[model samples]
Target chain A: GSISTAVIDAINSGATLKDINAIPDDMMDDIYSYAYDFYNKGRIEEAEVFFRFLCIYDFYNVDYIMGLAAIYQIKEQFQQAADLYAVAFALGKNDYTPVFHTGQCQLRLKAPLKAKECFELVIQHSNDEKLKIKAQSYLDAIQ
Target chain B: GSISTAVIDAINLKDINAIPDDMMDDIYSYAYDFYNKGRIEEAEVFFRFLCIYDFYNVDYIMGLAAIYQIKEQFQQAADLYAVAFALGKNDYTPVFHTGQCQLRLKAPLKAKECFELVIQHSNDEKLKIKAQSYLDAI
Candidate 1:
C-alpha cells in the first residue's frame, strides 16, 4: 500500500521481482496501477506492452488479462478480445463483466449464436443490475 | 506486541517487529551459531529475517555478507561488504572482507581501494601486514 525503494528497484531491475512479491501483493498492484493509468490516457499500445508482460508473468491476475483484452477490443480485433475476455472470465472465478464484454465482442464479430450464449450467461448469473439489463437487451436483439 | 486478530492480520504481512535490543542480540547469536555449524541454509533464513527488520544494523548486514561469502556469491558479498564498511566506518574488518570478496571476484581495482583504506587508517599492525600481503598478491 505504501512505497519502498527496495520494491521499486526490484520492479525496475528487469524481471527478477524474486522475494519482493513474496513480500506483498501490494507491489504487483502498484505496477497494475501504472499500466492502467496508461490505459486511461489512451496509450493503448503502451498499456498493451505492460499488460502483456503482466499477463505472462502474473498469469493468475484476471485484471491484467482484462486490461489486455480491452486493448484488443478498442483496436476492433474482436476475436482476440473474445478469447481474452473468456480467459478473464475463467480466471476471475466466473466474474460476469468479462462475459458481458465477451458478448459484446461476439456481437461485433456477428456470431449471434455465441453472442446469445454469452448474454444468456451474464443475464442469468450476474448480480450487477445495469449489466443484467444490458445483457437482456443484447439477448433480445439477437432474436 | 499485543494479541488481537485484527493487528495479527496487520502483521503476518510485513517485517514489522520492534522489540527489545537484547532480544535482537539473542537472534544474532542464533544466526551466528547456525552459520558456524555449517548449516548455511538455516543461517541464511535467520540472517535474511534479521536484515529485513533491521536494515541498518551492521552486524545483521555482515551476517548475510558471510552467508553470501560462504555460498561463493562474491559479487553480492562485495556489495554487501561495501555497505557494511560504509555503515560501520571505524571497523577495518569489513574493508578487509570487502578486499577478499573483490579479490575472489577477479576485480583487482575495487579490491585495491579496500586494501588501501585498511593500510591507511588501521592501527593494527597484524591486519595492516595482512592487507599488504593481499595488496602484493594484486
Candidate 2:
C-alpha cells in the first residue's frame, strides 16, 4: 500500500521505465495518476500490475482471471467468456459489475438468448442496484 | 523456534527414527520429550550419528582437548589447532575452558613473545573479545 525500497530498486532495474524520450511526459503522468486513482477506487485488477511490476508481490489469480475474462467478453468471445465467468463464479467470484459487463458483451455479440440467460441469472443472483437494473433492462431490450 | 515443516515432513516421509532393540525404549522416550519440548536443535545435533560415524560430540571434543592440554601432549599441535579453529567456523571452541591449556602447551617465552607482538600492533588489530561481544548479544 506504501512505497518501499523494493519498489525503488524495481524501477532502477532494467524494465525500460527510464526516460526514453519517445513517450511523452504528460502521458506518463496520466498513466501514473490513472493507476493511483484505479487503486484508490478499489479497481483491484488494474492496480495489481502497477504494484507487482513496481514491487515483488504474490499474485491473486482470481482478479487476473476477472480482468482477462472482461477482455475476452469485450472481444466478442461470449461463449468462452461465459465459461470463464462460470468458472470464476463457481470459485466464489461475485463482483456483479464485471458480470453485467459480460452480459452486455454477450448482447453485443447477438447472443440475445445467452444474454437473457445471463440477465436472468444476474437478477436471481446479484445484489447490485445499477447492475440489477441493467440486467432487467437488457432482458427487456432482448424481448 | 517454531516447528519448521520441512524437518517434520522429511522425518515422516523417510520413517527414519527407528531405534535398535537395546536403545529403543530409552531413546524413543527421550526423543518424544525432546520433540514435545521443541528442542529440535538439540535433537538434530544429537542425531548426528545418522549422518556421521564419529562419536565425538561437543562434550567429548571439549573433554579430550582439555585432558591432552593437561598432559602437555604437543605444544606445536595446540598452536596449530588454535590457529586452524580461530580461522574456522567454530572460533569459540577452544575458548570454552582451554585458554589456560593453550597457554601451558605453548613455550612460556614463545607465548609471552606472541602476546608482546600482539600488544605492539594492538592499535591495528581487532580483539577476539569484540567478536565475542557480538556473539554474546546474539
Candidate 3:
C-alpha cells in the first residue's frame, strides 16, 4: 500500500522514468507486486494502470506488456491484446510465449489464418514440450 | 491526444506525479473519459493520481471509491467514501456509496446511518427512494 501511495504521489508530481528507475530494483519489484496484487484480486482496471506505467518506465519489459495484454484479453479487446502481444514478441525477440498469446488473440479476433501462422512459428521456434502441446491444441482447433 | 500520449508515457515510466499542474485538467479529462467509456481500469490510474495531489477533492475521492466498489473491495471503498462524504457538503453520492460499501462489508447499522444522512440531504426524488430502500433493507 505504501509503495502504491508513493507511486501515486510520484505520478502526480511528474516523476519521469529516469526518476522512477533511480529507485532500488527491489522497490521496483515491490511496485510490480502491488500492481500484480490488484490483478490477482480481479481488479483488472487497477492492474492495467500499473502495468502500463511499468511499460512506460521500461518500454522493453516483456512481462509488463504481457500483463497489459492479458487485461485487454479479459475485456475481450482482442485487437489491442494482440497488438501488445506483438510488441512483447518483438521485445522478447527469441521468446515464444508472446507469439503463443498473439496466436490466441488472433483466434479470438476471428483471424484464423494469422493465428495459424503464429502457432506454427511458436512450434518451430521453441523446444518447450508443454508450450508445443498448447500451441498444437490451438492449431488443431483452428484447422 | 498528444497529452493523452504524454500522460500514458509518463505513467508507463512512473513519472506521472511530475506532470505539471497546468496539465492537470487534461489529465483529469483523460481519466474521466475512460470512466465514461466504461474503461474502469484505465480510469483508475488517473483518478489515483489526482487523489494524491488533492486528497480531499470530492471528484477524485468518489471516482476511486466507485472503482473500488466495482472491484468489490468493500472495505477500501468504505474508507474512501467516508473521506469523500466528509469533504462533500450537500453531495449525496459519497454518502450513498459509503452506505453501499458498508452494507457490502456487512455493517448494516452503519450503512443504515449513512442512508439516513442521504435521505435527509438528497433532493432527487428517485435517489431518496433508493436510499429508503437501502434503509429498509438494513
Candidate 4:
C-alpha cells in the first residue's frame, strides 16, 4: 500500500513526532534520499512506499514525484507515471527522465504511436550522445 | 631546438617583459600551450619552437617538454620533463594526462625496456594504468 494518507493528515493537523514513537523527525529527509537511491538501483515497490511518504511530508518535492513516476514505469504502470510526470512538469521541474522511460512503457503496452513522442522529448533534452543514439535507433527500429 | 641556460640568462639579466620588443613577453607560456595543442594535430615544428622558448620561461615549460615527448625527441624531451618535475614547479606540473602521454611516447619510440622502467618510477596509479594500457594497446 502507498503511505497512509490518514497518518499524514494527522501530522498536518498538529500531531507531533513524540505522539508517533515509531518514526523520528530528524531522519525523515535522509529516508527520502535513500528511497530514491533504492529506486535507482531497481528496488521498485519498496521505493514506492518511501516515495509516497516523501511526498506526504513535502508534497512540493519534484524529485520525489520523479522517483515515484520512475518506479511506476518499472512496475508497468504507465498511466500512473504519466499522471505524476504531468504534475512534476506543472511544478516546472526537469522531470524528463520518467517521460523518456515512458516511451519504453508505451512500447511494452504495444502503442508505437504514443511511444514516438515520449522518445522525441528524451532526445531533445538528453546530453548523452550514446543514449540519444539508442533512442533514435529504437524509434527507427519501430518505424 | 632545445631550451638552454643561455636563454635563461638572457631573460633574467634583461628587464624580462619590460625590454624593447624582440620576442613575446609570455613566449614560453604561449609555446607550451600551443605545443600541447599542436602535438595532438602532429604539428611538429610548432612544438619545437615551444621547447626552445621554455628555456626563457619556466611557466609552461613542461607543456613544451610533453610536446617533444609526443614527437619522439627522446633525450632532450626526457631531460626537460625530468628537470621540470625535479624543480617541483607548479607551472611544469605533473598530471595524469601528461604522465600517460610520456608512457605513450616511450612505447612509440620502441624503447620497451625504458617504457617498463618509467612506469615503475611513477608514484601515480593512474600513470601506471596508462602505461599498462598503452603497453597492451601496442
Candidate 4 docking DockQ = 0.01
lDDT of 3 by residue, B1-138 (tens): 887787777666224555566687888899889998999889988888787766546787778888878989776566555445434434667677778878878888778877876675467788789999987876
Q: Give the TM-score of chain A, superposed on the true chain A, for all candidates in the order listed.
A: 0.76, 0.51, 0.75, 0.66
Docking class of 3: incorrect
- Separately for all candidates shown, the number of backbone clashes (residues 3 or more apart, or on different chains) is 0, 0, 18, 0
Q: Model 4 misses residue A65 by how many Å?
A: 1.0
TM-scores, each model vs. reference: 0.47, 0.30, 0.42, 0.38
TM-score of 4: 0.38
Cα error of candidate 1 at position B116, Å: 0.8
Q: Which ten residues in a row are the worst by lDDT in model 2 chain B?
A: B48-57
lDDT value for model 1? 0.70
lDDT per residue as tens, model 2, B82-137: 32222221233443223334356543443433333233222333544443343343
lDDT of 1 by residue, A25-134 (tens): 78678878989999999898888888876765554356776787788889898876776665444332335787788789989998888789778877766789899999
- What local lDDT score does residue A45 receive in model 4, on the 0 to 100 scale? 73
Ordered list by TM-score, greatest first? 1, 3, 4, 2
Query: What DockQ number belongs to candidate 3?
Result: 0.02
lDDT, candidate 4, B1-138, per-residue tens: 234465576666233433334454455445545555654433334443443433323334455455555656544354344334323311223333334454555545333332343353445566567666756765
- Note the Cα lDDT for every prediction shown: 0.70, 0.44, 0.70, 0.53
Best prediction by TM-score? 1
10 residues in a row with least lDDT, candidate 1 chain A:
A1-10
Q: What is the alpha-carbon RMSD of candidate 1 to the true structure?
A: 22.9
